[PDB]
A paper describes a structure:
In Gram-negative bacteria, Fe3+-siderophore complexes are recognised at the bacterial cell surface by highly selective outer-membrane TonB-dependent transporters (TBDTs). These transporters bind the Fe3+-siderophore complex and translocate it into the periplasm. The structures of pyoverdine, pyochelin, citrate and ferrichrome iron complexes bound to their respective transporters FpvA, FptA, FecA and FhuA showed that the ferric-siderophore complexes were bound inside the barrel adjacent to the plug domain, a position thought to be poised for translocation. Pseudomonas aeruginosa, a serious opportunistic pathogen, does not make enterobactin but does possess a TBTD outer-membrane protein PfeA, related to FepA, that binds and translocates Fe3+-enterobactin into the periplasm. PfeA has the same two domains (22-stranded β-barrel and N-terminal plug) common to the TBDTs.
Azotochelin and protochelin are two siderophores produced by Azotobacter vinelandii, an environmental Gram-negative bacterium. Fe3+-enterobactin, Fe3+-azotochelin and Fe3+-protochelin coelute with PfeA on a size-exclusion column suggesting each of them are bound by PfeA. Crystal structures show that these two molecules bind in the same location as enterobactin (with less than 0.5 Å shift between the relative position of the iron atoms) and two of the catecholate rings occupy the same positions as rings II and III of enterobactin. Hydrogen bonds between the catecholates and Ser479, Gly325 and Arg480 are conserved. In the azotochelin complex, a molecule of ethylene glycol from the crystallisation solution completes the coordination shell of the iron, and this molecule interacts with Gln482. The stacking interaction between Arg480 and catecholate II has been conserved. However, the side chain of Gln482 is unable to form a hydrogen bond with the aliphatic backbone of azotochelin, and is slightly displaced. The carboxylate group of the backbone is pointing towards the surface of the protein in the vicinity of Arg480 and Lys218. The positioning of the three rings is clearly important in making the optimum interactions with the protein, indicating there are constraints on the linkage geometry. It is, however, worth noting that the connection of the rings tolerates the addition of at least one extra carbon, seen with protochelin and that a molecule with only two rings (azotochelin) can be efficiently bound.
Author numbering: 25 to 721
Write the structure that this text describes.
Amino acid sequence: KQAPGVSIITAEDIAKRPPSNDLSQIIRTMPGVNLTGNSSSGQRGNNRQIDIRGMGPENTLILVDGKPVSSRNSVRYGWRGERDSRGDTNWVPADQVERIEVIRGPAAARYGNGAAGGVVNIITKQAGAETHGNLSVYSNFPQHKAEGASERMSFGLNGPLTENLSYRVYGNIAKTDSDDWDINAGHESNRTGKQAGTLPAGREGVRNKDIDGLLSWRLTPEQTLEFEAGFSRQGNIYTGDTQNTNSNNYVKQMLGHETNRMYRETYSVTHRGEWDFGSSLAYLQYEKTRNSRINEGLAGGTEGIFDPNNAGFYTATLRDLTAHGEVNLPLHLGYEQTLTLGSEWTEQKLDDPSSNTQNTEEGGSIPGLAGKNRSSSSSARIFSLFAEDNIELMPGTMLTPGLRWDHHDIVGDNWSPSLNLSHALTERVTLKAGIARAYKAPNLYQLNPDYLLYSRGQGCYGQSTSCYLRGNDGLKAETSVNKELGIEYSHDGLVAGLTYFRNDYKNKIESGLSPVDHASGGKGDYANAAIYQWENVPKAVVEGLEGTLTLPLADGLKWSNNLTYMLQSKNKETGDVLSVTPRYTLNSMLDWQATDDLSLQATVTWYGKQKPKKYDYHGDRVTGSANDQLSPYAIAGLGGTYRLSKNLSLGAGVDNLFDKRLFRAGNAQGVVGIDGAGAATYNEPGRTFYTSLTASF
Ligand SMILES: O=C(NCCCC[C@H](NC(=O)c1cccc(O)c1O)C(=O)O)c1cccc(O)c1O
Ligand SMILES: [Fe+3]
């Protein structure tokens, strides 16, 4: 389950720590993984996503059965590096997942674009020889009614239909109620003037509907051909959340209603082949995401709040097209060694009506950018060639070099080399080392000179005058030299390991610091505003430790722990933090096999201190409640599963036994009328009982 750099979560694990709804809840308990925003603003702070080794969630590549999910790239990427997106770990329902693979650092660079943190690969249950299926129910029950309860019903059904033909289908309906609109009342940062009365919001609710079908068809002895289609829809339940925590009437009007809907449709064809030389695999995926949501503004404190002037839904469309080919070749060349070879092609088409609408009437106009009817379209294509040799040098020892080459049609050519070593020092001890250069192609918002944000001053680096931020097709890719050195003892279910990791992070893309130009014209003291672009930042660094310890106390009884310790996270230009994480995270399970039929699980997570950013959007040092830190705290849980037969199991437990609760107070920093909240940017739910039922053949 744990080795240096890599973790498997199994279906059995998912059952013993059932997630409310999204998988992030269990994925985040692996070593090296946090659940965090993408930068440090605190904006959209209850919408946290999986972060690997502090590299941010935009650098965590999500796969389903080896096939990329890109849906969140259909939500506007904002000034501060957040999208109002819940992420892409909630498309597959927990109970139909066979296993989840988390691959961190140098071992994941070979996956290419957006794996600079790592890869999470969510794998679904598949058909067997004979026909199986299940029906799964989960339902939880908050102690405090403000917080939103969750409900989940999913089914699976799999089997053969001819001797070489098989099917698997599954289907889910889920609800996670939102937190009440007022849950953070009494905990909010201090609000005066125009912003008096405003609230930072609790967790958004989400309604899920997921339906997948697969036909897998075995044309020859050594040939298999799979066709699959997926239909999912998440519609939220809105509870007041806005980028800056400000409000208007339209906001309040929408409390309790759907304000975003994400429809995700996937079709895929996959051929896997099994012959003398070795092994082929190739596929086509078409992912189409419709992001339909209420029009929002794009300027200043109006960035990311419903626009009352321009009311109604707009719809962003992401068409993502992916095709992949790989063959594997054993080579008996003195050295026993296996050799992978592969191309990849992807296209991202984005249609976005709202995001490019910000006009130039106030800050003055911008040579090269029309103030109106600018294009809705952007796109990018990456072509990719890659090869990996996995060498055996002696029994116990593998050396694994590979080279990935990527051609981005705008950004140019990228070379991501890698090397991974693992070394039996003893039958019980293994040393691992890895050093790779991973790749991040700018997203379509960063890249687009037609994408334009505006502020009167409040949000402008190094000044109080009006300014524009503009996309920049001159950008370089972000690269990162991810190093890791680790050691692990493993013998008779005793496991003890510690890994050190450092990622040197080059050309991290962020809103710029210096004006490149000044517009001309516009209104009053806001006229002739400064123009910044999205800029590559020369150097940043993350550093820390991953640990694991597993002791089998007796036969019936297993004690597990995973440790993250974050040593550093530094934008080396400005000196501020990249993400905000806990100083450490320790997850502890005790697993008692109380009878052949009963199993019992006690868990604790300890979170270290959390510190907010030091500098505001001006580059100036923050003061008062914008410095507020979160103290360390722990969350404990008991749960169990009582198997009534081969066909029927029941679960029950309590998450957060001792009711430790936290409340979003706002964003990190102060604006006019809204005192900052520092690191108190998210809501931690209180005690929550839950029950579950799984019927299966
Ligand atoms: O939250 C912010 N400011 C306090 C909320 C002001 C909301 C609202 N703002 C505007 O209408 C506005 C319009 C155009 C340009 C701006 O910079 C604005 O703040 C208002 O005027 O009351 C804020 C955050 C980042 C950047 C900014 O320029 C902000 O005003
Ligand atoms: Fe403003």
